[PDB]
Amino acid sequence: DGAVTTSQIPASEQETLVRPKPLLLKLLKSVGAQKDTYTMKEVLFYLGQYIMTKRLYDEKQQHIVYCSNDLLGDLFGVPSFSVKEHRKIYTMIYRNLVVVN
Amino acid sequence: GAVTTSQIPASEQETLVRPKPLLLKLLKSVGAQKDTYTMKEVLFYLGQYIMTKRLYDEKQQHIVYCSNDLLGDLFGVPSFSVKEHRKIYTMIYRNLVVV
Ligand SMILES: O=C(O)CCC(=O)NCCCCCCOC(=O)c1[nH]c2cc(Cl)ccc2c1-c1c(-c2ccc(F)cc2)ncn1Cc1ccc(Cl)cc1
Ligand SMILES: O=C(O)CCC(=O)NCCCCCCOC(=O)c1[nH]c2cc(Cl)ccc2c1-c1c(-c2ccc(F)cc2)ncn1Cc1ccc(Cl)cc1
């Protein structure tokens, strides 16, 4: 299973095991995820998959994602965001999941 | 899909190309349906291929290790930097056939 690491977020935090809520789980499965429980790295991996495959990044500024009017925009609750602002991105993903025990 | 740059003239990114069979197969493995693409479109599918297979280095995410992968056979290097767009265009241009 794919996973991505960032240098901006503590390791132990990236390794948290989590259970996506239904909308998020549906998004992940739409890009090939098979399971119900993931580390946060694996969640970041499949969301990268999704952004890429729907070409949500802006053609001119490819670090800006326009998620407005898209399921991702629903989940995150913003029209757009920068892929450089990782803590921000973790904050947005968190309300869409439950931590496992 | 489609993607573009700014180290390469935008006109040139729109150039219409016909990948050779191995490169075409690589593109088919990530969902490309056509025989001919814009260079932008080819780049887009190559970026997807690299993302999906995690060819990029874990730490240095702008470095791609293609050694021992079909991508390496095509490109003829074991690694390269995604920031060197001309070098990447050149590698792709060597893997086309004529429409
Ligand atoms: O040329 C330059 O100057 C810059 C080029 C460059 O450095 N490119 C490197 C791209 C590396 C991509 C590695 C894989 O990344 C991911 O899996 C990933 N997952 C994400 C999920 C979200 Cl919600 C947002 C972004 C990404 C993302 C990604 C992306 C990305 C950009 C556009 C796109 F369509 C897909 C992914 N770029 C870097 N990353 C790494 C990353 C990891 C964790 C976090 Cl919290 C944020 C970012
Ligand atoms: O997290 C951070 O702090 C910084 C991260 C960041 O800035 N991310 C930028 C967003 C990534 C953009 C994704 C869309 O890009 C592509 O479609 C693309 N296609 C390629 C084909 C090859 Cl052979 C190599 C790289 C890419 C690539 C890509 C990538 C990339 C990096 C790692 C990866 F696994 C996949 C794509 N990063 C930027 N790009 C843009 C780009 C466009 C044209 C050319 Cl000639 C070179 C690069």
Contact A41, A15 (CB under 8 A): yes
Chain A residues in contact with B58 (beta carbon < 8 A): 5
Question: Tokens 């803590």 label which residue?
Answer: A87
d(CA B80, CA A7): 21
Enter the tokens of residue A84. 């450089």
Kindly determine whether residue B47 and residue A49, on different chains, have CB atoms separated by under 8 Å. no
Name the DSSP class of A80.
E
Is any atom of ligand 1 closer than 6 Å to the C-beta of A57? yes
Kindly determine whether residue B2 and residue A59, on different chains, have CB atoms separated by under 8 Å. yes
Name the DSSP class of A84.
T
Kindly determine whether residue B3 and residue A62, on different chains, have CB atoms separated by under 8 Å. yes
H or E element in which residue B64 lies: strand B63-65
Report CA dihedral (B37, B40, B44, B50) to the nearest 10 degrees. 100
CATH number, domain of B99, equals 1.10.245.10
**In 3D, which of B53, B94, B89, B97 has the Cα closest to residue B73?**
B94
Enter the tokens of residue B97. 């056939």
Q: Which residue of A has its CA nearest to B40?
A: A59
**In 3D, which of A95, A62, A56 has the Cα closest to residue A79?**
A56
H or E element in which residue B81 lies: strand B79-81
Domain total in chain A:
1
DSSP assignment of A12-78 equals HHHT-EEEE-HHHHHHHHHTT---S-EEHHHHHHHHHHHHHHTT-B-SSSTTEEE-TTSHHHHHH-S
Q: What Å resolution does this PDB entry report?
A: 2.0
CA of B5 to the centre of ligand 2 (A): 9
d(CA B10, CA B13): 5
Nearest CA to ligand 2 atom 23: B46
What is the domain extent for residue A36?
1-101
For residue A20, what are the contacts with CB-CB under 8 A and spacing of at least 6? A28, A36, A38, A43, A96, A97
Report CA dihedral (B2, B54, A94, A90) to the nearest 10 degrees. -80
Q: Which residue of B has its CA nearest to A4?
A: B58
Chain B CB within 8 Å of residue A48 CB? yes
